[PDB]
Structures are given as C-alpha cells and as structure tokens.
Curated annotation (Swiss-Prot):
Belongs to the bacterial solute-binding protein 7 family. This is Solute-binding protein Dde_0634. It comes from Oleidesulfovibrio alaskensis (strain ATCC BAA-1058 / DSM 17464 / G20) (Desulfovibrio alaskensis). (indol-3-yl)acetate binds at Y69, R142, T180, S181, L182, D183, Y205. Solute-binding protein that binds indole-3-pyruvate and indole-3-acetate (in vitro). Can also bind D-tryptophan (in vitro), but that is probably not a physiological ligand. Probably part of a tripartite ATP-independent periplasmic (TRAP) transport system that mediates solute transport into the cytoplasm. Gene3D superfamilies: Bacterial extracellular solute-binding protein, family 7 (3.40.190.170). Keywords: Periplasm, Signal, Transport.
C-alpha cells in the first residue's frame, strides 16, 4: 500500500478541496486500497506560492495549482484564461483536459498532470453597485493572471493575489471587489462583505492537479492506468459539481444576505468584449515567442468546443 500526500491551498469547503477529496475517494476504491491519499487543505503542507516547487521537490507528492497564479510559466494552457465563451464549468473542464491530453505542452513536462478542471464563469462581486462600465472605472478589483489583464482592459484597477488572501483584503478596503465564480459567496462567505453581483459571463480560472514525476514513476503500471483512467471523468465531475454549487451558493447569498444582482446594458456587454479582443493576439505572440504554435492551439480549442 502506498500513501500519497496531496497538498491544497484553499479552505476545505472550497471546490478545489471538494474535488480533491472526491478524487482521493475514487483512487482508494478503484485501486482496492493499494493506494491511499492523505489530503492537506488550507495550505498546511504547501500554500499557493510554493505549491509547484514543493510538488517538484517532493515535499508533497500531489498538488493543485491555479494556473493564473503563475504568469508567463504556462504559455500554452493560459489560453484558457482568455474569454473562450464557456457558460459552464463542466464543458470548460472537459475541454481543458482534452486540450492538455492532445497537446502535452512542454511547460508541464517536469511534472505529471493527473487531471485538470476550471472554475465557473467569472462575475463581479463588489462592495458598491456596478450597474455599468462607467461604475467600474478606476475600481480596485481582485483577479489573477489574464483575468487581471481583462480587468485592466475594462478600465478597472487590477490587484492580483491568491484566493486565501482576498477576504482580509476586502475586509480592510484594499480592494473593492473581486472577479471570479460565485461559489465563493458561500464557500468563503463573501456574501457578507460584497453585497453586489454583476453578471459578466467572463473567462474561467483553469487548474491542474499535478504530481511529482518520481512519485508517479514508482507507481505500478496498473495503478497508473487507474489514475489516467480517472482523469477525464473527474474533470467532468468537478465542473458538474461546481455548476450546481454556484446555483446553491447564489440562492443562499440572495435570500439570507440581501445580495443585489445587476446586469450590464447591451451596449456595455458589446463594448467590453471589443476591449478584450486584443488579449488573444497578445496571448498568441507570447506563445509564439516561447516556441509554441498558437494557431494549432486555437484550432484545437475550436474543434474540442465543437464536440463538448
Ligand atoms: N478565483 C480563482 C478561481 C476560484 C474560484 N473559486 C475558488 C475557490 C477557491 C480557490 C480558487 C477559486 C482563483 O483564485 O484561483
């Protein structure tokens, strides 16, 4: 029997810890107890910042990284931080995994990728009402990676930071809101601090579950087939779980914390998407500079959406 330590950064109630426990449960069952997983939520073994270098060094066998936290490190997979028009985490998670499977880009070659998934589409959660793009001008809003670049294009003032830091940051006025999926309203009780939600339907945050290469290779071939066997299935399961939970989280925020929901005029939606168009070209150029083929990646994303 082997035991793998699985490091995670956010609290146990958030969906990246929920999916980790479900994955562990499937591993235990399909390997008939030949593999066990000891999980460490809340940064008790590795936090957001040292997660990648701590999995690669062996301080943890398995870890969960939010790709948007590591700008310039993932030139190919960061395409998934651009607005690709996904409305569900299930479809996004599934396409992300299939894209990774077919490309196996070199940026992730020093680790073994066990599975991937994404958040749901991002929205604005603010302390003060955002009813139009004008209200957003100058406003300090939390994002990370390309979601920050989207905020800047909209005229907001992006402040980049990992999730576990955001509550204190809101609570003390350093930021006026955040740009992400609405599950955090409940799971991290942002419904108490940010009383306003504005629909944006924007890019998702992509994640990878990563494993130390040596640890992966000391596993028997049949255990390895079980874990690879779980990859696509779990990507879909996570997105599915998250799409339902967003609905629950939001019903709970509205009818037990008075959260007000807003929607942008049709001309603001139009203008906002024109503003962000140039992020696709800046993404392609950064990718091309690091040796990847942005044309094939975009071709592949297109084909996989036409199919999920
Ligand atoms: N805000 C993004 C993605 C995200 C959405 N929900 C959670 C919950 C816990 C951690 C991250 C996220 C991010 O910071 O990665």
């Amino acid at each position: 029997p082997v035991t793998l330590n699985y490091a995670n950064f956010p609290p146990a109630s958030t969906f990246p810890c929920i999916q980790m426990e479900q994955w562990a449960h499937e591993v235990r069952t399909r390997t008939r107890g030949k593999v066990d997983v000891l999980t460490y939520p809340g940064g008790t073994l590795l936090g957001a910042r040292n997660m990648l270098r701590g999995v690669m060094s062996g301080q943890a066998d398995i870890g969960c990284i939010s790709l948007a936290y590591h700008p310039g490190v993932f030139p190919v997979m960061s395409v998934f931080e651009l607005p690709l028009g996904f409305t569900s985490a299930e479809a996004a998670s599934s396409v992300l995994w299939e894209l990774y499977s077919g490309l196996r880009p070199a940026e992730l070659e020093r680790v073994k990728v066990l599975t991937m998934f994404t958040s749901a589409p991002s929205h604005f959660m603010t302390v003060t009402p955002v009813r139009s793009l004008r209200d957003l001008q100058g406003m300090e809003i939390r994002g990370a990676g390309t979601l920050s670049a989207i905020l800047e294009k909209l005229g907001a003032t992006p402040v980049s930071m990992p999730m576990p830091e955001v509550p204190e940051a809101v609570q003390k006025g350093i930021i006026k809101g955040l740009f992400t999926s609405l599950d955090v309203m409940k799971d991290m009780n942002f419904a108490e601090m940010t009383g306003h939600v504005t629909r944006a339907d924007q890019a998702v945050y992509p994640f990878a579950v990563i494993m130390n290469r040596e640890a992966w290779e000391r596993l028997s071939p049949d255990v390895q087939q079980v874990l690879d066997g779980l990859a696509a299935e779990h990507a879909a399961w996570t997105g599915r779980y998250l799409d339902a939970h967003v609905q629950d989280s939001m019903r709970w925020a509205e009818e037990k914390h008075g959260v007000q929901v807003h929607t942008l005029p049709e001309e603001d939606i139009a203008a906002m998407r024109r503003s962000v168009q140039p992020l696709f070209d800046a993404w392609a150029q950064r990718a091309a500079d690091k040796g990847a083929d942005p044309d094939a990646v975009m071709r592949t994303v297109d084909a996989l959406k036409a199919q999920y």
